[PDB]
């Protein structure tokens, strides 16, 4: 009998493909192929960045790169991702602070709402 | 020089790294 | 517009390659009639050639006219015939490995490929009938002869696609193999022609190259090896040889011609 | 000096524009947006000299109950080129019991490719040639030692009983008259011809790029 190639492909991706290529159960990770090789920003990298803000200061991403990500992480991209995970285009008022996880989500929601009521919410960041 | 940045084949992240490196060198000359 | 379509525009070499006439003088050519080429000792009739074109026709279907890899095995090629030269042999689909095995057995080595992308003079006519329905009432033979071609802008529908047990046969491969020599040096002219050229054929006879295509091959050989060409010093020392030659287009200036049971 | 200060204002504007572009791209990525890669493609990113083919054989025998039917190959010929003998050291014999192989050979590595696929247990039956094309529809260009190189060939070896189903006879064509693109990219007409030869079926392809991914193919590569 003929077989369905969707389930076969999911099963093959489960045990053969890397964790960066396949998602959850068996689905394909499209963000991996929407980005050139070597710059994917894995969820492990995102959690490492969140732990870096949790532990050390914000805006001091030199020791963060040195002893938190791999010893080799893309500066400027770290600033971009920290901008994206606060809902604000700039980190000028957050330099030198050590924002916790709950405060991070609270300030992200506050920035999103503040850009919402003043009409600055352009791809969930606030321009100032 | 903006010509290296001006290339279309580059992505938005390497372009932005180039812009920041240009800022670093020209702010070094501004300090000079 | 005339003279801008793909068929009319990949086939101007035909206009630029008119064939010449036969050589009247005996001192220009050398014609040998033999009963069995594979059983022949060609050294008694030739020596130190640099271009050995073999116009061999294969059968590869048991019940068909042609030669075989056994016949190529029986053929004798020695150092006194070729010490520094290039052999040109018509290749096929199934027996390419056997050809290269038997020829690298005799000191030769594969160097280059030169093929003819086949086109159909009848499929273009039938495409003109399909796309038109008072000039396309002719024979494909007359279409080849008078160089009157139908306008096509997508040639990958008139390719000669002969029957096969696999991907349909659509090209004629000429294998070129060079017997290197450490002492002597072969003089060559590099990149004077392309390794691929289109040429019109017929559906019933796809392995019979036209006069202009055969002359294109001959001028490719002659331009590749200029010192083998006819000159005042090559009288009786012709450096180009033929095997399984035919009366159709062979006898040329400076070519040794060996026939098969005339 | 104020010319570089005007350049600084312009570079601030360029940074703001590219900041917005990056944020838009990463917001659309973290949303409903798929790449050009088909959802049924199976990519494996591993070095072939370090890849364990036993796991691949076990997975294919488990999740399909069969073996591969077509193995396409574009080897990194040494003339990131790997080697000439390391390609021969591949465990191709275990990866197929009945099917075809497609090895794209350059002019300098033609006879060694033929010897390689004859040593793997295959029999030469056909070759597929790619004639390059221009925008206007010419034969593009070439350079070589004897002739101008305007072609590229793929060598096909056969194995087992291909006449016992899963394959079609007298299809497609040997010549692909298609325009060149990229740097070493091959046309998709070879994939169309493969699908014509083997409708449905299981495929493996050992040296692949991110443009080599298709909705029925297992693709191996160093960056893919
Ligand atoms: C040999 S060419 C193949 C390109 C392909 N034909 C295309 O359509 O572009 C370059 C490819 O070889 C891959 N490659 C080179 N060495 C490799 C190796 N040892 N193992 C796996 N892939 C390798 C590269 O990563 C790249 O994908």
UniProtKB/TrEMBL annotation, chain A:
This is Transmembrane protein, putative. The chain holds residues 163 to 290 of 295 of the full protein.
UniProtKB/TrEMBL annotation, chain B:
Signal peptide: none annotated. The chain holds residues 152 to 183 of 360 of the full protein. This is Myb-like domain-containing protein. It comes from the Eukaryota.
Automatic annotation (TrEMBL), chain C:
This is Methyltransferase MT, putative. Keywords: Methyltransferase, Transferase. GO terms for biological process: methylation. GO terms for molecular function: methyltransferase activity. It comes from Tetrahymena thermophila (strain SB210).
TrEMBL record, chain D:
S-adenosyl-L-homocysteine 4 binds at residues 212, 222. One of its GO terms (biological process) is methylation. S-adenosyl-L-methionine 2 binds at residues 47-48, 186, 209, 211-212, 222-223. S-adenosyl-L-methionine 1 binds at residues 47-48, 222-223. S-adenosyl-L-homocysteine 3 binds at residues 47, 184, 222-223. It comes from the Eukaryota. S-adenosyl-L-homocysteine 2 binds at residues 47-48, 186, 209, 211-212, 222-223. It catalyses: an adenosine in mRNA + S-adenosyl-L-methionine = an N(6)-methyladenosine in mRNA + S-adenosyl-L-homocysteine + H(+). S-adenosyl-L-homocysteine 1 binds at residues 47-48, 186, 211-212, 222. S-adenosyl-L-methionine 3 binds at residues 47-48, 223. Its EC number is 2.1.1.348. One of its GO terms (cellular component) is RNA N6-methyladenosine methyltransferase complex. GO terms for molecular function: mRNA m(6)A methyltransferase activity. Keywords: Methyltransferase, S-adenosyl-L-methionine, Transferase. Signal peptide: none annotated. Belongs to the MT-A70-like family. This is mRNA m(6)A methyltransferase.
